[PDB]
Amino acid sequence: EIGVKPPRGILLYGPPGTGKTLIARAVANETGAFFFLINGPEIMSKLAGESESNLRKAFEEAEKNAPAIIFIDELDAIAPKREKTHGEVERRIVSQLLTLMDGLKQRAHVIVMAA
C-alpha cells in the first residue's frame, strides 16, 4: 500500500564467531516461510555445467514454495572477483548468480541471505 518493494538480498558479514549462521539457524527455526539452505562449495558438480544448474534448480525450488528464504553460507566460496578468477566454471557460476539476483525482482516473493 505504501509502495516500496521488500529488500531482496541481505548480506551478513563479520569476523568469525559473531553469530551469522546462528542468525540463519534462528530464522530457519522460527520463520513461517519455507527455508532453503545453500552451502557454496556444495554447488560444485563434476558434470559439465551442472553447478550452474544446481544454483538454478535451488532458485526454482524456492519459486515453487513461495514465499521462501534462501541462505547462501560462505558466499565468498562461490562469489569471487571475476576479474581475478582463473576458472571458467567459477566465472559462469558467478554470472549465473548475478542473473538470478537480477531476476529476483521478477520472483516478487523470495528473499536471499548470505554470510
Closest CA to 24 of 58, 72, 63, 76: 72
Report the residue from 27, 37, 65, 92 that binds a second copy according to the rule CB under 8 A. Answer: 92
Whether residue 14 is annotated as binding a ligand: the answer is no
Nearer to Mg ion, 67 or 80 (CB): 80
User: Residues, the chain, total?
Assistant: 115
Listed ranges 10-18, 23-31, 43-51, 57-65: which one lies at the site for a second copy (CB under 8 A): 43-51
- Near a second copy by CB under 8 A: residue from 17, 29, 47, 64: 47
The residue from 10, 13, 49, 66 that contacts a second copy (CB under 8 A) is 49
Own/partner contacts of 56-63, CB < 8 Å, gap of 24 or more, are 56/96, 56/100, 59/100, 59/107, 59/110, 61/36, 62/34, 62/36, 62/107, 62/110, 63/107, 63/110
Instruction: List 112's β-bridge partners, or say none.
Output: 9, 70
x-or-dash string of contact with ligand ATP, 4-43, rule CB under 6 A: ------------xxxxxxx---------------------
* Amino acid present at 51: S
Q: Which residue is nearest to Mg ion (CB)?
A: 21
What residues line the site for Mg ion (CB under 5 A)? 21
Q: Which residues are documented as binding site for ATP? A: 16-22
